[PDB]
Amino acid sequence: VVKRTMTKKFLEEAFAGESMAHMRYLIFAEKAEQEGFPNIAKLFRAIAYAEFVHAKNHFIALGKLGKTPENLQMGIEGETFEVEEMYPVYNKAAEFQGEKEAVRTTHYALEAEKIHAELYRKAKEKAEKGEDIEIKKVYICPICGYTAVDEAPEYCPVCGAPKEKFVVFE
Amino acid sequence: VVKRTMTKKFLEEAFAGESMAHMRYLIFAEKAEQEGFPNIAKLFRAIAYAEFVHAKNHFIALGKLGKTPENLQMGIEGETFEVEEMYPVYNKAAEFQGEKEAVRTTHYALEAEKIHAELYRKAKEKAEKGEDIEIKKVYICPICGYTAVDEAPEYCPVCGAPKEKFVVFE
Ligand SMILES: [Fe+2]
Ligand SMILES: [Fe+2]
Ligand SMILES: [Fe+2]
Ligand SMILES: [Fe+2]
Ligand SMILES: [Fe+2]
Ligand SMILES: [Fe+2]
16 A cells, blocks of 8 residues: 555546546547447447546555545545535535536436435445445436436436436446 | 636636546446456446536537547547657656656556647548548557557567457447
8 A cells, every 4th residue: 555645646647637537538439429420439438448447556556445435435525525515515505606507417416426425324234334335226317317216207307308318227 | 608717717627627537436336346346336427427428518618629620620639748748857857856657657658649730630631621530440459548449469569568458349
């Protein structure tokens, strides 16, 4: 596990940079598919996986990967920070500054992170007893990221989208 | 497109935080699968897609998404920054500090980013003339992120993993 302060800081910066490159590449893949370039989309999705590999390597060098219950707890802490601190503040600043698209994107994320934090708390209670959770399907809204388990709502309560547009993970 | 300086800075921070949450959840899904929690792994992958929606929404509110050739150009400039500036300095700092694990993760990423820069350069030449690239498959080394289009060596030239272990996008 890396211990020296400067190299630790640089691998945390590199983990952010790799995670952003991967994310930009998944967003560009979808745009290339929409524009009629399916092979460039394939190239972006494949290079996004290579950046997952680099990010995972820095993450494990920093000692941040544990077992499932401890990884759930990292998710609980992150999501609870976003719910209680980061997105309420960014949303209020965007409203104060009149930036309506940012009010919308922070509101979309904040309503979904409240659900994420509770789903991870429920999962950790099972994994702490050595049990997997009992969920068949997870539905995610492609507009806002609202998240629901086992049945999609008739429409998304955050953006209005109909049940039929949810993306299903089974 | 967001224009006020503080809201833009907060949506850039939120894009990085969403990107890192998505990356953590992909890393945790693989670990949950390894440990015998398939339904928790499914939950982490579905929530990772929700954080891709959140990140994409902030990135579009920032005005950073364009057409395919301009997205490839963002890719060329980001890869070239990692190749010429960021990873050579982080790898020399880790060497100077004795942090062998960080020398390794930065060396793995730098050798792959040299390839990703040239692949995006070749793809943008095509996309600028309205052509897709012609590729059948892309191979990614799951240890180091070495990347090869259509033909790959029998062993990764960076870490020596056998081609049977490469992840294939086709
Ligand atoms: Fe990378
Ligand atoms: Fe979340
Ligand atoms: Fe929605
Ligand atoms: Fe999120
Ligand atoms: Fe790269
Ligand atoms: Fe490799």
